[PDB]
Design a protein around this ligand. Structure first.
Ligand SMILES: [Cl-]
Length: 241
């Protein structure tokens, strides 16, 4: 009960349009089942903080899967969850390691709501959930429940030097001096940085960053809560340089 059926359907009300390749795949019942694997997701903090965690998770995943455009019906921030796999599937996304070795003939391109990528992410996730995602990465795009479990797993897991998205949005992250001079003050912008900052943050205005913010504001307005501070990353140095 971290979110109701009718709220879920209104948030994602164009995902089953004829133009959307993932039509029929994303369901309320499968999201609720995946959430049970991570009981602290959506239940941490006061009432306003729980609402902001739900709006931020669906804001970032909506951008990663959007089919919107500026004159779309009900505006561009009603078109999340239209896709479920990366458009260009040429690359294998292999970064060789003894810990998580790349399986022969397999490819670790983006799948599901968070567009999970690279062998080390499929590997760590599969270990945590007791699933064989390193040998069978397609499961993140073919099984309705596992697709959501992989996205929530990423949201909840720190990867040094990055904190978890969960910790940042619930107020459990405390920035160091190094973070402060890089412009990384706590808020929605730092979450964009964790997810894809190497390509999107610190260079000035960027259309992808604006689109992430638009979805988050719409969902916050639906729940009647304020946005918080520091929403963009136009002036933040990326993690890991
Ligand atoms: Cl948890």
């Amino acid at each position: 009960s971290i979110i109701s059926r009718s709220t879920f359907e209104e948030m994602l009300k164009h995902r089953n349009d004829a133009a959307c390749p993932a039509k029929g795949f994303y369901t309320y019942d499968a999201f609720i089942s995946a959430a049970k694997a991570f009981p602290a997701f959506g239940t941490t903090g006061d009432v306003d903080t729980c609402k902001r965690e739900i709006a931020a998770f669906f804001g970032q995943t909506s951008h990663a899967t959007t089919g919107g455009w500026p004159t779309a019906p009900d505006g561009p921030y009603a078109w999340g969850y239209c896709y479920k796999e990366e458009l260009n599937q040429a690359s294998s996304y292999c970064s060789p390691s003894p810990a998580y070795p790349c399986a022969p003939g397999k490819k670790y391109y983006g799948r599901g709501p968070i567009q999970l990528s690279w062998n080390y992410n499929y590997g760590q996730c599969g270990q945590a959930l007791g699933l064989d995602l390193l040998n069978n990465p397609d499961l993140v795009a073919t099984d309705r429940v596992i697709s959501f479990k992989a996205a929530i797993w990423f949201w909840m897991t720190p990867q040094f030097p990055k904190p978890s998205c969960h910790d940042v949005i619930t107020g459990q992250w405390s920035p160091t001096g190094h973070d402060i001079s890089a412009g990384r003050a706590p808020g929605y912008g730092v979450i964009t940085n964790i997810i894809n900052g190497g390509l999107e943050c610190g260079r000035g205005w960027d259309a992808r960053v604006e689109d992430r913010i638009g979805f988050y504001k719409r969902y916050c307005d639906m729940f009647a809560v304020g946005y918080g501070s520091n929403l963009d990353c136009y002036n933040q140095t990326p993690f890991g340089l």
